[PDB]
């Protein structure tokens, strides 16, 4: 009871709150920025031993949490009906959160079934552009904010049917382009990036082109020529036509020569049928149906004509990222106490989280097995 626990003035349960953070790093500012009416904080020290790896009714080091929350059995004493676990946004924070969750799950299932365990969501990014401030907590939110700042009322002027291309259509086009570039960066682990970036401007391809050899030859010749033209590093590009079929089944083959070893990349029916290639072809057709050679976009007092859409996008991002400031908090004991009160534990501005007891599965059984921990990593 003494030492670390700092209760509130109110003694009636179901009205106060309990928190669990790092003691010396966080609890100091937490107590200096909390309220003295219905706030209570229980500091912690390091990590907590696992339950399944070493199960012993006599093994105990701290024992303060279970002794202060209940009597350890629990229906009698139900003090602190509402508990919230604040935790850092680092990986060790997620680890200790997982340990705390499995602890409260394997010790007292009733307090979790009745909806008493809560999870906080502290902010992650602090963007300040002069007077304009912004609190961002997620990576996707940060990306959306960057896209919004990079498109502060842009207006494109090309020689297409639209004299002044602007509005939500350009935003949707940029979003689809970013999603496709992310997909290409994800698939880059399999195939090189040069061909995937070049197929954006190259003409379309159809499985009906396997009849005429001249069309495939012209296509692969244009591909190899443009790759050799755009190649500024120490590499080359060669073409190859092979017939492994009954009559034709024409399949192009690209031969690239890196530093010391050549490597081919044949094309099969499965590659043409695949949904990724179809999406790439649709995006390429959509971009070629724009005629974006002579373009004029301004954001917001200057414009510069370019010859590539990605170059204009990079220029806009660079112009938007000139004089902005970003502060990333990597710990609760880094920000001011008033900022913590306003952004994390403000009863009118906080955003808590509720845990459920939907299903009882054997995930905790495979948590520490040395076999489940080896078969689970199937992130490929």
């Amino acid at each position: 009871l003494p030492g670390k626990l700092a209760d509130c003035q109110e003694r009636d349960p179901a009205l106060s709150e309990l928190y669990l953070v790092e003691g010396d790093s966080a609890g100091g500012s937490a107590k200096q920025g909390r309220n003295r009416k219905n706030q209570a904080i229980l500091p912690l020290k390091g990590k907590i031993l696992n339950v399944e790896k070493a199960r012993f009714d006599k093994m105990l080091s701290s024992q303060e949490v279970a002794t202060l929350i209940t009597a350890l059995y629990n229906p009698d004493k139900l003090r602190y009906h509402s508990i919230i676990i604040m935790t850092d946004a680092d990986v060790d924070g997620s680890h200790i959160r997982t340990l705390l969750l499995t602890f409260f799950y394997r010790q007292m299932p009733e307090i979790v079934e009745r909806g008493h365990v809560y999870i906080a969501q502290p902010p992650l990014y602090k963007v300040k552009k002069g007077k304009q401030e912004q609190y961002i907590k997620d990576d996707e939110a940060m990306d959306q904010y960057q896209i919004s700042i990079a498109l502060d009322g842009a207006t494109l002027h090309t020689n297409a049917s639209a004299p002044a291309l602007a509005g939500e259509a350009l935003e949707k086009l940029v979003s689809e382009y970013n999603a496709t570039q992310k997909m290409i960066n994800r698939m880059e682990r399999r195939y090189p990036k040069a061909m995937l970036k070049e197929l954006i401007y190259q003409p379309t391809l159809t499985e009906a082109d396997l009849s005429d050899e001249q069309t495939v030859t012209r296509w692969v010749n244009a591909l190899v020529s443009e790759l050799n033209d755009k190649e500024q590093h120490g590499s080359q590009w060669k073409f190859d036509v092979h017939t492994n079929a009954e009559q034709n089944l024409f399949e192009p083959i690209v031969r690239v020569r890196t530093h010391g070893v050549d490597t081919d990349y044949p094309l099969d029916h499965e590659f043409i049928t695949g949904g990724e290639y179809r999406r790439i072809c649709t995006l390429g057709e959509k971009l070629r149906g724009l005629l974006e050679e002579d373009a004029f976009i301004e954001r917001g007092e200057r414009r510069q004509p370019v010859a590539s859409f990605e170059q204009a996008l990079d220029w806009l991002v660079k112009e938007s990222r000139r004089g902005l400031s970003i502060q990333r908090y990597k710990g609760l004991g880094e920000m001011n106490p008033e900022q913590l009160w306003e952004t994390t534990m403000d009863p009118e501005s906080r955003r808590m989280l509720r845990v459920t007891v939907k299903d009882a599965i054997a995930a905790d059984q495979l948590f520490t097995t040395l076999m489940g921990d080896a078969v689970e990593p199937r992130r490929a």
Binding site: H233, R354, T356, K358, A363
Partner: protein, 522 residues
């Protein structure tokens, strides 16, 4: 606002933490065999500028710098890593040359971080050689304010020379050290024959190496480890019996202890075993270790052969311990069991790529320098018209415009290769005698001094131009042909082997097969 969430967040956070620990904390790489902590420490020491031929510096400054810029994850881990790199008996080849209490085999910890003085060594400069020549990629720091090199342009396969012992969330690795000369010989043999067999590599490299000598007995274990990736090997200490010329008594001498063995704990365990009657033939125990070599003296009990007691000790005392060989590392950011040939091939490919990128960088630099020197020589050819143009133009911008717009005569005294004397971005509308200037060229001309008008600068400029021509020709030749690049790699490897050669420390006495095979199949 209390949104309802599912329990799957537990598994999600656990998977995220496991992936993070496996990728960025535990498992090293195969191209250099270095942890990110060691990488950040070496990069900080390189940026600070603490060479081997300089004075010592306090370790607290380096630790604080590393914590502030690159590794903000405590202080104890960085200091322990520095102490481990400073211990000679912990690595086959030390990297950080220090001075102070660095601990010993007795288990005594090092002193505080306010007493020791450390600096880089001669071999450490070979690890991060040719880094500023744009040879590798840069990675942003935690807040996006600095740059960190992805890999180091190394010349020595530290993964095979020293190795490491780390454990992931579900994986674990352990690699014994080796000798540098045999690794260089194996690399040269692999360069000679791309289709070399495992038997040839085993013949080139008999077995591992340790900072302290020992006796290796198992050969099938290391053979399976080199062939598959898993195996066990036994380590035996060096000892013998002693009989005086007179009646005297028998005495056992311990010259060396196995790898990673505490001496005080060993003496305590031996004393406990003698007290518990578990071991016989031992009367007392003494010690004669000094600054000339460790020496342990054990008095043999009277009326005892001592060989049976020695065998009982070898069976019970920690002088004979196994070893968990396990080769696990990252190949493309994913745990993959790799053999020796794959590591050698990856090292060769990395070296080829680094050499090629360095050559391209040097070629671009020489091209730019020669392009500037050509304009400088053209300006030095005709000077008087430039004098009138400067004296009559009130504005320097107008003078630059007049210099760029007006052609020149291209005197006979001013006047190489057919091509490769101009940058790629330069437009063909310049340098068609006839000659035209450039804004950058005119700016460089306006930045000349008065000392460049002597009877000595012209010959120096001509010699520098000839040297640049020779350099760009040699670079084009080495980029055109790959055999020259392979010969350069071979020469560099031979030079490194000649500079950093040494002698074997350990010894391998094979008895696991001599006792088994010749007594089973005869």
């Amino acid at each position: 606002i209390t949104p309802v969430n599912i329990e799957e967040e537990l598994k999600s956070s656990y998977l995220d933490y496991a992936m993070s620990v496996i990728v960025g904390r535990a498992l090293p790489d195969v191209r250099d065999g270095l942890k990110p902590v060691h990488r950040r420490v070496l990069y900080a020491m390189n940026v600070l500028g603490n060479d081997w031929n300089k004075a010592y510096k306090k370790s607290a400054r380096v630790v604080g710098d590393v914590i502030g810029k690159y590794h903000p994850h405590g202080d104890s881990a960085v200091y322990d890593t520095i102490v481990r790199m400073a211990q000679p008996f912990s690595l086959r080849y030390m990297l950080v040359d220090g001075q102070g209490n660095f601990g010993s085999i007795d288990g005594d910890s090092a002193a505080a971080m306010r007493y020791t003085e450390i600096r880089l060594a001669k071999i450490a400069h070979e690890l991060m050689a040719d880094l500023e020549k744009e040879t590798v990629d840069f990675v942003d720091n935690y807040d996006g304010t600095e740059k960190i090199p992805d890999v180091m342009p190394t010349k020595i396969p530290n993964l095979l020379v020293n190795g490491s012992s780390g454990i992931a969330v579900g994986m674990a690795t352990n690699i014994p050290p080796h000798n540098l000369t045999e690794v260089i010989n194996g690399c040269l043999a692999y360069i000679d024959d791309e289709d070399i067999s495992i038997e040839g590599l085993m013949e080139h490299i008999p077995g591992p190496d340790f900072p302290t000598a020992a006796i290796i007995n198992g050969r099938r274990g290391i053979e399976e480890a080199y062939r598959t990736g898993r195996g066990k090997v036994y380590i035996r200490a060096r000892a013998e019996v002693e009989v005086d010329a007179k009646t005297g008594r028998e005495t056992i001498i311990v010259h060396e202890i196995p790898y990673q063995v505490n001496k005080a704990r060993l003496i305590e365990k031996i004393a406990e075993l003698v007290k518990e009657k578990r071991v016989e033939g031992i009367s007392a125990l003494r010690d004669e270790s000094d600054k000339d070599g460790m020496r342990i003296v054990i008095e043999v009990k009277r009326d005892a052969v001592g060989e049976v007691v020695l065998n009982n000790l070898y069976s019970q005392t920690q002088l004979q311990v196994s070893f968990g060989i396990n080769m696990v590392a990252l190949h493309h950011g994913q745990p993959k069991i790799m053999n020796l040939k794959d590591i050698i091939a990856a090292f060769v490919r990395h070296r080829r790529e680094v050499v090629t990128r360095r050559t391209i960088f040097e070629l671009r630099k020489a091209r730019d320098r020669a392009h500037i020197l050509e304009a400088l020589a053209v300006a030095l050819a005709n000077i008087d018209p430039i004098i009138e143009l400067i004296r009559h133009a009130p504005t320097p911008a107008e003078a630059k415009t007049a210099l760029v717009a007006n052609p020149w005569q291209l005197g006979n005294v001013a006047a190489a290769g057919d091509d490769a004397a101009r940058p790629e971005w330069l437009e063909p509308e310049f340098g068609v005698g006839l000659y035209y200037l450039t804004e950058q060229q005119a700016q460089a001309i306006l930045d000349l001094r008065l000392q460049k008008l002597t009877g000595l600068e012209h010959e120096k400029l001509l010699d520098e131009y000839k040297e640049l021509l020779d350099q760009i020709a040699e670079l084009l030749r080495i980029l055109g042909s790959a055999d020259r690049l392979m010969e350069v790699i071979r020469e560099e490897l031979e030079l490194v082997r000649e500079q950093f050669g040494d002698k074997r420390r350990t010894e391998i006495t094979a008895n696991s097969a001599d006792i088994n095979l010749e007594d089973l199949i005869t």
